[PDB]
Structure 1
Amino acid sequence: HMSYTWTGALITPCAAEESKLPINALSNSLLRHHNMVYATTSRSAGLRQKKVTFDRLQVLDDHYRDVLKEMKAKASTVKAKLLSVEEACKLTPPHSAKSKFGYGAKDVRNLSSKAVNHIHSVWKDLLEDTVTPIDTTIMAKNEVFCVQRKPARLIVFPDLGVRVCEKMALYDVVSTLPQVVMGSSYGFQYSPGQRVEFLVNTWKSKKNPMGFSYDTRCFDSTVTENDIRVEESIYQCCDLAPEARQAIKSLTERLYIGGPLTNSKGQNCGYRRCRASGVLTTSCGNTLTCYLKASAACRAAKLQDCTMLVNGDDLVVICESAGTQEDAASLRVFTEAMTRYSAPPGDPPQPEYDLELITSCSSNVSVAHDASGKRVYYLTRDPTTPLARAAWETARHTPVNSWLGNIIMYAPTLWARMILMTHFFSILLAQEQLEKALDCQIYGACYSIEPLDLPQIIERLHGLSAFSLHSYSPGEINRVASCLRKLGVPPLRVWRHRARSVRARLLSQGGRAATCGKYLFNWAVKTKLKLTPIPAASRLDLSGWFVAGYSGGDIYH
């Protein structure tokens, strides 16, 4: 029951890859320890192949089937619709990988006759054949990190015509089913502010709270044929059109269960028998499976009043403590049950008794004060990876601007406000690119955002307090300051000095640029302005934001 079989053919790149941090005239103003930053390339794909390849054994008990029966009962209340070809076409990212059949993502988006005719033939083939394995491309992802080197992660995706078909059959399912099945435990329905609120309320709801995060080692490869057929049985509980039931059965049998792996040069690399990382159902499938195995493992471990918070393969559990030593034994039983379900741990879970010490989705809860001095909980993270990625993005244009996603999602943080905002607004001002729409990702979905709209977006997600937070925790300040020395980033005092200049430069431009100066950099001046709601913020169409997760799902809004 191997996750993969391999032929020995290499996982090949599509273009020239860089691993060393590119340097330009702006690099040193952000980060001096250049050797600390690197990008993963296809060159390390061979090491990843070794890591993701293993036998999976599954032992399914009554706790597993009990939880699954409960999930199916909630899934049976979902009604889902088929998207038209045109609706699914418009969800395609403009720079999505081109089809092998003579058309690209722009042809799909423009509803070109050639693209639409091929998509209709792919749809007809899904309905008429529910057996033939569908071809997939295997590629090494190019992602940036700080040292202490990770081998490249792999992406496995079917052809563009198939991806549009996945959307038609399952977009509405993967968008609506997880919240119905898991209720408040589904993490992707929350903005960062709502996530904090859920975590704090859950922690407060326990007499003696204990919490842990569970890290499954190589989650996609732990996903078995059983798991994928179980996911399909959940999707089939929905009230669906008969053509959608047939397409979902066909996509499960031909694509989701497994299939051949083809490199960028057209060679057969091998065969997958686990979760594909680049399909529409990756996020929803991972969330349902992680929640199912974890809920059953919570029952097997006799964990008391377990509240789960699940986002794909990321899991946080908050429960009632039975004292430190019993909690430690309980987590070892939880881990044993997860292992039997084919979800073994990477790092062993650690019980926590301070909400701020739990790391989930690479983040933790922290506290600052608003302008009235009131304590305000917000989400932050170690800024090492956002800063290494910001350094790369300082010298190279990339398809996804992590700096923009990080300013949006981490706007209340000390590090996103003082460093990311200051640095990228300085660069954009100098290039007169404040109005240029840039691509970023939020919960795996692609968005095209104009940096000039950042004050309005931040206000809608985090509220006006994101522009007034101060008196950050000693722990948070020290982690940020430690990260800056480690990477050779100028200290916060330099950033405050630079921000006064950036703020003045933005105010000089007037209009939307002045609003950026006013709201984003009010922290930098001694004579603070009283910030009031932005009228443009109410007009923002933030629908489609914080509904579901779409990592690897080829979704654009």
Structure 2
Amino acid sequence: SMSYTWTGALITPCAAEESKLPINALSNSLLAHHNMVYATTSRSAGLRQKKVTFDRLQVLDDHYRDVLKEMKAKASTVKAKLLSVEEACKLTPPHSAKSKFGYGAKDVRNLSSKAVNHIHSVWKDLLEDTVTPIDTTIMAKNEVFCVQPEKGGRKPARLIVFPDLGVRVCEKMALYDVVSTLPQVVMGSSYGFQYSPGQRVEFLVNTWKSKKNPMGFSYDTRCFDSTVTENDIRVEESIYQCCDLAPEARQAIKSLTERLYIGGPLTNSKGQNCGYRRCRASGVLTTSCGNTLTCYLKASAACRAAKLQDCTMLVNGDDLVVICESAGTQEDAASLRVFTEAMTRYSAPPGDPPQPEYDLELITSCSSNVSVAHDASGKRVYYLTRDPTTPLARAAWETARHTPVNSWLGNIIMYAPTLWARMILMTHFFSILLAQEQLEKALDCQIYGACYSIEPLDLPQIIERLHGLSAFSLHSYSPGEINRVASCLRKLGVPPLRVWRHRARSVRAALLSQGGRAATCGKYLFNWAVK
């Protein structure tokens, strides 16, 4: 079946779509090559549509079936409860899309009459009608990136398909408790979302050291969401069904998969029919869970097909990393291909061919990799890093706009231990916060799903609880890490690491002298700044 079937209708935007990075004298202070940072818009839609639209031919085998039966077996040990309309409401995110029926997120979070009522009926309908395809709207996501000449350079806006607040809350009622527990029960340590940056590192590093001759590789599937077959979606349902669920939950889950998950009609921000979807929707409660489950199912069977030894997989979304015992370089190269052969057979073709890695640091999963540094006492400390291009590009942008989302603050927290987050992000922004008076002003920062209200003067406490303290005194970064960062900076036209060391020196001072709490930041976040 075709992943999508479109219809002349254009995927229209809903507000002003920014294209170029705004020219700020302060942003220039961090990014001079602004003509390399761009945001995606509806205009790319067409390009995107051609990338995600194709026929899927899936063929399963015993490897697949055995893994699936094994999974169901474990799913059958799970018990999940229905959430009440109210609970499901208190769990809906603060800035979700308003509903086409007169109410928004605030309204939901407040248990307003309008919302609560609508939900209830939307719920009564799921239960009573289990066939009418549910409506979803398709949009072109606006995300900031940096040009990459080595290839197409500019990437076409991502496409997001979502069902509508009312329904979206009903999903929670029916699957919130499942989407949670179930993934981790089925794949144990393989379920990536259970780990924090450091626990991820700890799990990867321990697994790596557990092989006599470790070989690892990340596998990237081409437009994973579009590779998901109705078969896949139904298989997910069967697994969810193996759980001990309330009768009403079963009805909704079945109904939701037939009326939404399996696929459905796509419609404009203008209201016109845009086409039909026959693959995964990106905007449903079930997306991450289903993708993890499916990616894991396929990958497991593919591993068995390639006869990989001591496989250990880490799966997040469509994101997948495998680590095993090397059978020899030539032997691994063949394995990989058989792996990817079976993988595409399962309808999960690769984007760029997987390459075997023998150097843990060179393995990138979830856009990140493991690296080494040393702590004060001088011991080895493994932390998680990533190329800083995107975090920087976005840092820039969010410096030249109010942008209600502080991705920068997110990276400062998630990558606190890293060389770049410490010397640049922290410096650069604690700079602006000192300049202005907004040092006590909380900021909305999104991370691990949730949206937090973070007070800058709390970073020390957060970072400590997240990474340990080592994070305030790490040094001697791997030559490769240091090299990549420095490189990245030239490309983006940002001040060199030595300049930041300076800007930090003052920051540490202006802060240390400005009080106690702020001093505490100066002491910890910038302890490295001076000796």
| TM-score (structure 2 length as normaliser) | 0.97
Residues 89, 109 of structure 2: 8 Å contact kept: yes
- From the superposition, tell whether residues 107 and 236 of structure 1 become closer, same or farther in structure 2 (CA, over 3 Å): same
Structure 1 distance, partners of 2:95, 2:510, is 33
Alignment deviations for residues 453-493 of structure 1 (CA, whole Å, 9 cap, x no partner): 21111111110101100011111111111111111100111
Q: Partner of 1:461: helix, strand, or coil?
A: helix
Gaps (5+ residues) in structure 1? 526-557
Alignment deviations for residues 36-57 of structure 1 (CA, whole Å, 9 cap, x no partner): 1111111111110110000000
Correspondence 1:80-119 to 2 at 5 A: 80-119=80-119
Q: Partner of 2:499: helix, strand, or coil?
A: helix
Q: Partner of 2:433: helix, strand, or coil?
A: helix
Alignment deviations for residues 62-89 of structure 1 (CA, whole Å, 9 cap, x no partner): 0001000011111111111111222211
Q: Partner of 1:70: helix, strand, or coil?
A: helix
Residue number in structure 1 paired with 2:151? none
Residue number in structure 1 paired with 2:331? 326
Alignment deviations for residues 339-385 of structure 1 (CA, whole Å, 9 cap, x no partner): 00000000000001111111111111110000001011111111111
Instruction: Tell me which moved more, 457-466 or 86-95.
Output: 86-95
Residues 459, 521 of structure 2: 8 Å contact kept: yes
Alignment deviations for residues 264-311 of structure 1 (CA, whole Å, 9 cap, x no partner): 111110011000011111111100000000000001111111100000
Are 1:31 and 2:31 an aligned pair? yes
Are 1:9 and 2:14 an aligned pair? no
Structure 2 distance, partners of 1:278, 1:266, is 18
Structure 1 distance, partners of 2:90, 2:442, is 18
Structure 2 distance, partners of 1:389, 1:486, is 15
Q: Partner of 2:174: helix, strand, or coil?
A: helix
Structure 2 distance, partners of 1:511, 1:80, is 47
- From the superposition, tell whether residues 312 and 383 of structure 1 become closer, same or farther in structure 2 (CA, over 3 Å): same
Instruction: Tell me which moved more, 374-383 or 216-225.
Output: 374-383
Residue number in structure 1 paired with 2:21? 21
Structure 2 distance, partners of 1:515, 1:421, is 14
Residues 140, 157 of structure 2: 8 Å contact kept: yes
Structure 1 distance, partners of 2:48, 2:449, is 22
Instruction: Tell me which moved more, 269-278 or 81-90.
Output: 81-90
Residues 93, 450 of structure 2: 8 Å contact kept: no
Residue number in structure 2 paired with 1:161? 166
Residue 187 of structure 1 and its aligned partner are, at CA, apart by 0.7
Structure 2 distance, partners of 1:237, 1:337, is 26
Residue number in structure 2 paired with 1:132? 132
Are 1:120 and 2:120 an aligned pair? yes
Residue 439 of structure 1 and its aligned partner are, at CA, apart by 2.6
Q: Partner of 1:68: helix, strand, or coil?
A: helix
Residue 505 of structure 1 and its aligned partner are, at CA, apart by 2.3
Residue 452 of structure 1 and its aligned partner are, at CA, apart by 2.2
Q: Partner of 1:138: helix, strand, or coil?
A: strand
Q: Partner of 1:296: helix, strand, or coil?
A: helix
Instruction: Tell me which moved more, 448-457 or 46-55.
Output: 448-457
Structure 2 distance, partners of 1:248, 1:440, is 32
Structure 2 distance, partners of 1:159, 1:337, is 37
Instruction: Tell me which moved more, 279-288 or 505-514.
Output: 505-514
Q: Partner of 2:446: helix, strand, or coil?
A: strand
- From the superposition, tell whether residues 513 and 99 of structure 1 become closer, same or farther in structure 2 (CA, over 3 Å): same
Instruction: Tell me which moved more, 124-133 or 440-449.
Output: 440-449
Residue 95 of structure 1 and its aligned partner are, at CA, apart by 1.6
Residue 450 of structure 1 and its aligned partner are, at CA, apart by 2.4
- From the superposition, tell whether residues 290 and 445 of structure 1 become closer, same or farther in structure 2 (CA, over 3 Å): farther
Alignment deviations for residues 184-232 of structure 1 (CA, whole Å, 9 cap, x no partner): 0111100111011101110111111111000000000000000000011
Structure 1 distance, partners of 2:442, 2:294, is 36
Residue 397 of structure 1 and its aligned partner are, at CA, apart by 2.2
Residue 433 of structure 1 and its aligned partner are, at CA, apart by 2.3
Q: Partner of 2:69: helix, strand, or coil?
A: helix
Are 1:516 and 2:516 an aligned pair? no
Alignment deviations for residues 143-173 of structure 1 (CA, whole Å, 9 cap, x no partner): 0011011000011101101111111111111
Residues 168, 284 of structure 2: 8 Å contact kept: yes
Q: Partner of 1:28: helix, strand, or coil?
A: coil
- From the superposition, tell whether residues 89 and 511 of structure 1 become closer, same or farther in structure 2 (CA, over 3 Å): farther
- From the superposition, tell whether residues 91 and 438 of structure 1 become closer, same or farther in structure 2 (CA, over 3 Å): farther
Q: Partner of 1:236: helix, strand, or coil?
A: helix
Structure 2 distance, partners of 1:477, 1:204, is 24
Instruction: Tell me which moved more, 391-400 or 181-190.
Output: 391-400
Structure 1 distance, partners of 2:132, 2:201, is 45
Alignment deviations for residues 83-128 of structure 1 (CA, whole Å, 9 cap, x no partner): 1222211222222110000111111111111111011111111111
Residue number in structure 2 paired with 1:552? none
Residue 512 of structure 1 and its aligned partner are, at CA, apart by 2.9
Q: Partner of 1:29: helix, strand, or coil?
A: coil
Count of aligned pairs between the two proteins: 524
Structure 2 distance, partners of 1:513, 1:81, is 45
Residue number in structure 2 paired with 1:259? 264
Residue number in structure 1 paired with 2:471? 466
Residue 509 of structure 1 and its aligned partner are, at CA, apart by 3.4
Residues 292, 315 of structure 2: 8 Å contact kept: yes
Residue 437 of structure 1 and its aligned partner are, at CA, apart by 2.9
Structure 1 distance, partners of 2:270, 2:137, is 10
Q: Partner of 1:365: helix, strand, or coil?
A: strand
Residue 316 of structure 1 and its aligned partner are, at CA, apart by 0.3
Q: Partner of 2:28: helix, strand, or coil?
A: helix
Residue 427 of structure 1 and its aligned partner are, at CA, apart by 1.5
Structure 2 distance, partners of 1:241, 1:452, is 45
Structure 1 distance, partners of 2:122, 2:451, is 24
Residues 385, 415 of structure 2: 8 Å contact kept: yes
Structure 2 distance, partners of 1:86, 1:511, is 42
Structure 2 distance, partners of 1:389, 1:253, is 39
Residue 245 of structure 1 and its aligned partner are, at CA, apart by 1.1
Residue 494 of structure 1 and its aligned partner are, at CA, apart by 1.0
Structure 1 distance, partners of 2:286, 2:394, is 27
Alignment deviations for residues 311-356 of structure 1 (CA, whole Å, 9 cap, x no partner): 0100000011110001001000000000000000000000011111
Instruction: Tell me which moved more, 16-25 or 267-276.
Output: 16-25
Structure 2 distance, partners of 1:254, 1:120, is 17
Instruction: Tell me which moved more, 39-48 or 501-510.
Output: 501-510
Residues 75, 243 of structure 2: 8 Å contact kept: yes
Residue 506 of structure 1 and its aligned partner are, at CA, apart by 2.3
Among candidates 336, 345, 357, match of residue 340 of structure 1: 345
Structure 1 distance, partners of 2:78, 2:265, is 33
Structure 2 distance, partners of 1:82, 1:430, is 50
RMSD of Structure 2 on Structure 1 (CA) = 1.1
Residue 423 of structure 1 and its aligned partner are, at CA, apart by 0.9
- From the superposition, tell whether residues 53 and 190 of structure 1 become closer, same or farther in structure 2 (CA, over 3 Å): same
Structure 2 distance, partners of 1:442, 1:72, is 31
Identity of matched residues, %: 100
Residue 442 of structure 1 and its aligned partner are, at CA, apart by 2.4
